[PDB]
Symmetry: D2
Subunit: 30 residues, 4 copies
Protein backbone atom coordinates (compact mmCIF):
# COMPACT_ATOMS: atom_id res chain seq x y z
CA UNK A 1 0.00 0.00 0.00
CA UNK A 2 2.24 2.89 1.03
CA UNK A 3 5.03 2.14 -1.45
CA UNK A 4 2.48 1.79 -4.25
CA UNK A 5 0.99 5.15 -3.35
CA UNK A 6 4.43 6.81 -3.29
CA UNK A 7 5.22 5.23 -6.65
CA UNK A 8 2.01 6.69 -8.07
CA UNK A 9 2.99 10.13 -6.73
CA UNK A 10 6.33 9.81 -8.51
CA UNK A 11 4.58 8.87 -11.76
CA UNK A 12 2.39 11.96 -11.45
CA UNK A 13 5.47 14.14 -10.87
CA UNK A 14 7.09 12.58 -13.95
CA UNK A 15 3.98 13.54 -15.96
CA UNK A 16 4.17 17.09 -14.58
CA UNK A 17 7.84 17.35 -15.58
CA UNK A 18 6.99 16.16 -19.11
CA UNK A 19 4.37 18.94 -19.31
CA UNK A 20 6.96 21.52 -18.26
CA UNK A 21 9.44 20.18 -20.80
CA UNK A 22 6.83 20.57 -23.53
CA UNK A 23 6.07 24.12 -22.42
CA UNK A 24 9.78 25.01 -22.54
CA UNK A 25 10.09 23.54 -26.04
CA UNK A 26 7.12 25.59 -27.20
CA UNK A 27 8.69 28.76 -25.73
CA UNK A 28 11.94 27.95 -27.52
CA UNK A 29 10.30 27.11 -30.87
CA UNK A 30 7.30 29.47 -31.10
Amino acid sequence: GQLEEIAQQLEEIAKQLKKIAWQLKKIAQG
Copy 2:
Protein backbone atom coordinates in the same frame (compact mmCIF):
# COMPACT_ATOMS: atom_id res chain seq x y z
CA GLY B 1 19.90 26.19 -26.95
CA GLN B 2 19.30 26.49 -23.32
CA LEU B 3 15.56 25.88 -23.07
CA GLU B 4 15.87 22.81 -25.31
CA GLU B 5 18.68 21.49 -23.11
CA ILE B 6 16.63 22.09 -19.97
CA ALA B 7 13.57 20.42 -21.48
CA GLN B 8 15.71 17.38 -22.27
CA GLN B 9 17.04 17.26 -18.73
CA LEU B 10 13.49 17.40 -17.34
CA GLU B 11 12.44 14.54 -19.62
CA GLU B 12 15.48 12.57 -18.42
CA ILE B 13 14.58 13.25 -14.78
CA ALA B 14 11.01 12.15 -15.49
CA LYS B 15 12.34 8.87 -16.88
CA GLN B 16 14.51 8.40 -13.79
CA LEU B 17 11.55 9.04 -11.48
CA LYS B 18 9.53 6.41 -13.34
CA LYS B 19 12.37 3.93 -12.94
CA ILE B 20 12.41 4.67 -9.21
CA ALA B 21 8.63 4.23 -9.06
CA TRP B 22 9.06 0.85 -10.75
CA GLN B 23 11.68 -0.19 -8.22
CA LEU B 24 9.35 0.79 -5.37
CA LYS B 25 6.55 -1.30 -6.89
CA LYS B 26 8.99 -4.22 -7.24
CA ILE B 27 10.03 -3.92 -3.59
CA ALA B 28 6.39 -3.89 -2.53
CA GLN B 29 5.17 -6.80 -4.61
CA GLY B 30 8.07 -9.17 -4.59
Copy 3:
Protein backbone atom coordinates in the same frame (compact mmCIF):
# COMPACT_ATOMS: atom_id res chain seq x y z
CA GLY C 1 5.97 35.49 -16.33
CA GLN C 2 6.25 32.04 -17.62
CA LEU C 3 9.84 31.15 -16.76
CA GLU C 4 9.35 32.44 -13.20
CA GLU C 5 6.18 30.34 -12.88
CA ILE C 6 7.98 27.26 -14.18
CA ALA C 7 10.93 27.82 -11.85
CA GLN C 8 8.50 28.00 -8.94
CA GLN C 9 6.82 24.78 -10.00
CA LEU C 10 10.21 23.03 -10.20
CA GLU C 11 11.09 24.25 -6.70
CA GLU C 12 7.72 22.94 -5.48
CA ILE C 13 8.33 19.56 -7.13
CA ALA C 14 11.78 19.45 -5.52
CA LYS C 15 10.18 20.02 -2.12
CA GLN C 16 7.67 17.24 -2.81
CA LEU C 17 10.45 14.83 -3.80
CA LYS C 18 12.28 15.59 -0.56
CA LYS C 19 9.11 14.88 1.40
CA ILE C 20 8.80 11.55 -0.41
CA ALA C 21 12.46 10.79 0.33
CA TRP C 22 11.76 11.50 4.00
CA GLN C 23 8.79 9.14 3.99
CA LEU C 24 10.93 6.40 2.43
CA LYS C 25 13.57 6.89 5.14
CA LYS C 26 10.81 6.71 7.79
CA ILE C 27 9.47 3.47 6.32
CA ALA C 28 12.96 1.99 6.32
CA GLN C 29 13.98 2.98 9.82
CA GLY C 30 10.81 2.68 11.79
Copy 4:
Protein backbone atom coordinates in the same frame (compact mmCIF):
# COMPACT_ATOMS: atom_id res chain seq x y z
CA GLY D 1 19.53 -0.15 2.50
CA GLN D 2 17.61 -0.02 -0.77
CA LEU D 3 14.99 2.49 0.41
CA GLU D 4 17.73 4.72 1.82
CA GLU D 5 19.56 4.62 -1.49
CA ILE D 6 16.38 5.48 -3.42
CA ALA D 7 15.72 8.33 -1.00
CA GLN D 8 19.22 9.68 -1.65
CA GLN D 9 18.58 9.51 -5.42
CA LEU D 10 15.41 11.54 -4.91
CA GLU D 11 17.33 14.14 -2.88
CA GLU D 12 19.87 14.42 -5.70
CA ILE D 13 17.06 14.90 -8.24
CA ALA D 14 15.56 17.60 -6.00
CA LYS D 15 18.94 19.37 -6.01
CA GLN D 16 19.09 19.09 -9.82
CA LEU D 17 15.60 20.59 -10.12
CA LYS D 18 16.63 23.50 -7.86
CA LYS D 19 19.59 24.13 -10.19
CA ILE D 20 17.28 24.20 -13.21
CA ALA D 21 14.91 26.56 -11.42
CA TRP D 22 17.80 28.93 -10.72
CA GLN D 23 18.91 28.77 -14.35
CA LEU D 24 15.37 29.63 -15.52
CA LYS D 25 15.22 32.58 -13.12
CA LYS D 26 18.53 33.87 -14.44
CA ILE D 27 17.25 33.57 -18.04
CA ALA D 28 14.12 35.48 -17.05
CA GLN D 29 15.96 38.21 -15.10
CA GLY D 30 19.25 38.70 -16.98
